[PDB]
Design an enzyme around this catalytic site. Structure first.
Site, mmCIF file in Angstrom:
data_model
loop_
_atom_site.group_PDB
_atom_site.id
_atom_site.type_symbol
_atom_site.label_atom_id
_atom_site.label_comp_id
_atom_site.label_asym_id
_atom_site.label_seq_id
_atom_site.Cartn_x
_atom_site.Cartn_y
_atom_site.Cartn_z
ATOM 1 N N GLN A 110 16.228 28.322 42.118
ATOM 2 C CA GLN A 110 16.231 27.864 43.493
ATOM 3 C C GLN A 110 17.179 28.731 44.332
ATOM 4 O O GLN A 110 16.882 29.098 45.461
ATOM 5 C CB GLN A 110 16.645 26.398 43.536
ATOM 6 C CG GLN A 110 16.476 25.773 44.888
ATOM 7 C CD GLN A 110 16.689 24.286 44.851
ATOM 8 O OE1 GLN A 110 16.844 23.703 43.782
ATOM 9 N NE2 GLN A 110 16.666 23.655 46.015
ATOM 10 N N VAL A 113 15.460 32.160 45.171
ATOM 11 C CA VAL A 113 14.389 32.030 46.139
ATOM 12 C C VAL A 113 14.887 31.714 47.536
ATOM 13 O O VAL A 113 14.349 32.218 48.520
ATOM 14 C CB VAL A 113 13.374 30.974 45.699
ATOM 15 C CG1 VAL A 113 12.435 30.641 46.825
ATOM 16 C CG2 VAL A 113 12.590 31.498 44.516
ATOM 17 N N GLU A 114 15.925 30.899 47.628
ATOM 18 C CA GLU A 114 16.452 30.542 48.937
ATOM 19 C C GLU A 114 17.143 31.731 49.579
ATOM 20 O O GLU A 114 17.133 31.886 50.806
ATOM 21 C CB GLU A 114 17.401 29.353 48.833
ATOM 22 C CG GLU A 114 16.670 28.071 48.500
ATOM 23 C CD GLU A 114 17.584 26.870 48.406
ATOM 24 O OE1 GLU A 114 18.804 27.048 48.150
ATOM 25 O OE2 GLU A 114 17.074 25.742 48.578
ATOM 26 N N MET A 115 17.686 32.600 48.734
ATOM 27 C CA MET A 115 18.378 33.773 49.208
ATOM 28 C C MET A 115 17.448 34.879 49.676
ATOM 29 O O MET A 115 17.650 35.438 50.745
ATOM 30 C CB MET A 115 19.283 34.320 48.123
ATOM 31 C CG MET A 115 19.882 35.641 48.487
ATOM 32 S SD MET A 115 21.405 35.888 47.640
ATOM 33 C CE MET A 115 22.541 35.078 48.761
ATOM 34 N N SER A 117 14.115 34.575 50.110
ATOM 35 C CA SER A 117 12.932 34.108 50.785
ATOM 36 C C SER A 117 13.263 32.691 51.183
ATOM 37 O O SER A 117 14.411 32.375 51.535
ATOM 38 C CB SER A 117 11.747 34.151 49.827
ATOM 39 O OG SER A 117 10.519 33.873 50.493
#
Ligand code: HEC
Ligand code: HEC
Ligand code: HEC
Ligand code: HEC
Ligand SMILES: [Ca+2]
Ligand SMILES: [Ca+2]
Lengths: 317, 317
Positions: A110, A113-115, A117
């Site tokens: 997580q 992905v948050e970083m 996108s």
């Protein structure tokens, strides 16, 4: 053998395969889907970064460059740890404040992905490709929304469970084959336990299970004569005890990736005042011992990723 | 069939395998060594770029991002062309001045290494790793200096010869199977020849054999209504006729990678005044036809690269 005795009390071998995850059996569809995702650069907004970029399966599962920035937890650049056998690590990141490490509710997947996108973006991306849509339905049948961040995370973990390295000499020795390690490696194993290395580096991965208030720093000026592992500014600031499996394949070392040679890394730790001061022979023997931790490297067939369609988001910053 | 007749006069299928290169038989050792090199990021001074980075074997052999800068010939950023079937291309780069293209004495491999590293550096790097040293001796037995830029280039070419995509429908059709292409694809194939597309896109790779003074530009303002393929500022400045095999897998299109949809790329070319003006049906049929050029994607087993040693150069800018 008494040596094999204390060894077995402190360490454990890598299972030949993990078949269950979060109490759920791992299917082959999940494994395959996970493999695709691990290599798909489209999980990054820019379409140039994939997990494999930094956790290169061809070079020990790590990128082998001093540092990189791949997960949101990071306060700065850190050396990319190998992804091999990571599924067994309770402690995942390099360092942090004790209170915050009880707030890093987010896992590596997580975080990344948050970083690079956003979950919504990643979902919109995978959804635009029919092959993925199908692969998700076949891998997570009893699911409302088959293409979701949750399932993606699950798929990747399934593939991660596949990246284990069993049968290293050390493990063969633990399993019985007392011939697996030569005399030098045995002196090393002995010294490793005797000098208190195993106090922090123990368990299945010889580390990766706990945090301690010591970290590498460049001496104010007092490799092995340029860096040292000392106490953090307060016992609230801790570093994870790096899991040592496959360590001979993932130089440079320490969170900043500043020491390139294993002999130096060993000397430095054996001078940290965390046990009996090491003797040159020991350093050599220990290094020999560490080499016995290189397991069988995973054989990976590069996946064939499906083509983007007209509704697939285009690259960006 | 008359259609199959002119088709066979203009095109040729991808052989199942190339076994000889520069009049030398390709051994398996050469193939394996080449594979390692193609994936080894240590060929770049920074240890982060490998051929696979930009010519991704999992996504059509191209990175599928608008542009990148990987070879010294480049006057600027260009879309990375696929590496699949590249061995059959006489014309290798996107564009250039006719006189200079008779001076680009350098091939893709030398061009890239000189740009992201240096031959001396690459040699020093490979030489510090025993496994490579050996692999080179086993692959080039009758050689004075086994580890040399020359041999490295040869090895990579050998691996390149492995990255071919035979058996696309179109090829099955050429080989005989008149059922390989459906009616729409046949109308497309017909239109492709009738509109003069084959004037430039012909031969084994439907292009990649010659240069022409036309290139995509953004209209001064007159996708398909935003870009156009027009004459260069003088017939001395030319662009290579992009080989179309596997084109459905390598969007975006044109040297600048500015058009994302194949239908647009087709419309734009079919409006370049390089043949009969295209009709909507044709554009659709042609696209259908182009899809028949996707061959069998290579199955690649990710190589296990040997570990760096103490004399292996460390990363840099
Ligand atoms: C480079 C830009 C990376 C990308 C892209 C991904 N990872 Fe990563 N990962 C990277 C670093 C620098 C680190 C250390 C961060 C820290 O401060 O601790 C990591 C760490 C992980 C871990 C934890 C390791 C453990 O033993 O538990 C995992 C398991 C991991 N990364 C996995 C992984 C996956 C699945 C990724 C793609 C979705 C991913 N990383 C991307 C750097 C990079
Ligand atoms: C607990 C306080 C430890 C003891 C006892 C030893 N090590 Fe350790 N080790 C520990 C930490 C917190 C870290 C990370 C520090 C950082 O700044 O990153 C490490 C790391 C290593 C490494 C590097 C591994 C890698 O980078 O992948 C090695 C090779 C290592 N430690 C070896 C080692 C030896 C041989 C020890 C006793 C002689 C030893 N460590 C003790 C924590 C602890
Ligand atoms: C991205 C930074 C790249 C890296 C690294 C490599 N290549 Fe590349 N390659 C790239 C581009 C942008 C282009 C087009 C350049 C131009 O102006 O024409 C290319 C082209 C090639 C070609 C020619 C294609 C043909 O059909 O003949 C080949 C064959 C090729 N590149 C191979 C290749 C190899 C073997 C590399 C590693 C040694 C290499 N490229 C690195 C971008 C990138
Ligand atoms: C010779 C003058 C050409 C004729 C006749 C046609 N094409 Fe072409 N095509 C040509 C060039 C010089 C280029 C590159 C221009 C640039 O700026 O990059 C191309 C490229 C294409 C593409 C893009 C392929 C890719 O980017 O990988 C397509 C899809 C294409 N051409 C198709 C096409 C069709 C369908 C044609 C006739 C109807 C046609 N081209 C004619 C040169 C020439
Ligand atoms: Ca490392
Ligand atoms: Ca392209």
């Amino acid at each position: 053998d008494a040596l094999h005795d204390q060894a077995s009390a402190l360490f454990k071998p890598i299972p030949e395969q993990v078949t269950e995850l979060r109490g759920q059996p791992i299917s082959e569809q999940q494994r395959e889907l996970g493999k695709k995702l691990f290599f798909d650069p489209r999980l990054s907004r820019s379409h140039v970064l994939s997990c494999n970029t930094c956790h290169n399966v061809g070079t020990g599962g790590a990128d082998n460059v001093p540092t990189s920035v791949g997960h949101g937890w990071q306060k700065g650049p850190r050396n990319s740890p190998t992804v091999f056998n990571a599924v067994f690590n309770a402690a995942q990141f390099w360092d942090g404040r004790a209170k915050d490490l009880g707030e890093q509710a987010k896992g590596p997947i997580q975080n990344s992905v948050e970083m690079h996108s956003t979950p919504q973006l990643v979902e919109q991306t995978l959804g635009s490709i029919p092959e993925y849509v199908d692969a998700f339905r076949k891998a997570f049948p009893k699911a409302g929304k088959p293409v979701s961040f949750d399932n993606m995370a699950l798929a990747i973990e399934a593939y991660e469970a596949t990246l284990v390295t069993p049968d290293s000499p050390f493990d063969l020795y633990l399993k019985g084959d007392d011939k697996a390690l030569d005399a030098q490696q045995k002196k090393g194993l002995k010294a490793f336990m005797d000098s208190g290395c195993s106090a922090c580096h123990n368990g299945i991965n010889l580390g990766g299970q706990a945090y301690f208030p010591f970290g590498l720093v460049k001496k104010p000026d007092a490799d092995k004569g340029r860096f040292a592992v000392t106490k953090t500014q307060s016992d609230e600031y801790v570093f994870r005890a790096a899991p040592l499996r496959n360590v001979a394949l993932t130089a440079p070392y320490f969170h900043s990736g500043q020491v390139w040679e294993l002999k130096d890394a060993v000397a430095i730790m054996g001078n940290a005042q965390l046990g009996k001061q090491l003797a040159p022979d020991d350093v050599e023997n220990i290094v020999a011992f560490l080499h016995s931790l290189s397991g069988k490297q995973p054989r990976v067939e590069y996946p064939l990723l499906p083509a983007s369609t007209e509704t697939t988001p285009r690259p960006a910053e």
